[PDB]
Design a protein around this ligand. Sequence first.
Ligand SMILES: Nc1nc2c(ncn2[C@@H]2O[C@H](COP(=O)(O)OP(=O)(O)O)[C@@H](O)[C@H]2O)c(=O)[nH]1
Ligand SMILES: [Mg+2]
Length: 164
Amino acid sequence: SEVAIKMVVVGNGAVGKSSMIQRYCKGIFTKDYKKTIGVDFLERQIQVNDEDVRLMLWDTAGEFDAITKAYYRGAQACVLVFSTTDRESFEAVSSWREKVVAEVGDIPTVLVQNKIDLLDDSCIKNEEAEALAKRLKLRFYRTSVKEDLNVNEVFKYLAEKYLQ
Ligand SMILES: Nc1nc2c(ncn2[C@@H]2O[C@H](COP(=O)(O)OP(=O)(O)O)[C@@H](O)[C@H]2O)c(=O)[nH]1
Ligand SMILES: [Mg+2]
């Protein structure tokens, strides 16, 4: 048998949420300005602690109350994403954490700074990001979906945290 885990990936527009889901589940990254997923989630079968696990990664479309409720319904873990090159996306992180708690509760959550390959154009100081993760008591990953750096670790950690 297998354990199914619904995970939500949230954050401001263009931080790389759709790309992150496509990378993890399909192993691909294209150079398009915006990535789209035409179904509610992509999935990947993995092994965690000698258990078959079906991860279902739900991608946001962009919300009205019923849309928000359907997206978060039954969510079991959360990736909170901001972008190295988008200051507003970083400043919104605390509000995203509050929003996920409001919509589903205090589910296992990880903080991800995506686009770390664009470090020369970074709008975030390393110390600021570290302080935010410490204040929110969240594990923090610096990630590049484009270069496949610290993507797999995000989902493995959340799956382990959910099962443990
Ligand atoms: N340089 C770089 N671009 C990225 C990375 N991840 C995503 N992008 C690009 O950021 C843009 C927005 O990505 P998308 O997945 O549509 O973001 P979403 O709106 O959060 O779903 C696209 O051009 C992606 O290819 C990354 O790690 N590095
Ligand atoms: Mg998207």
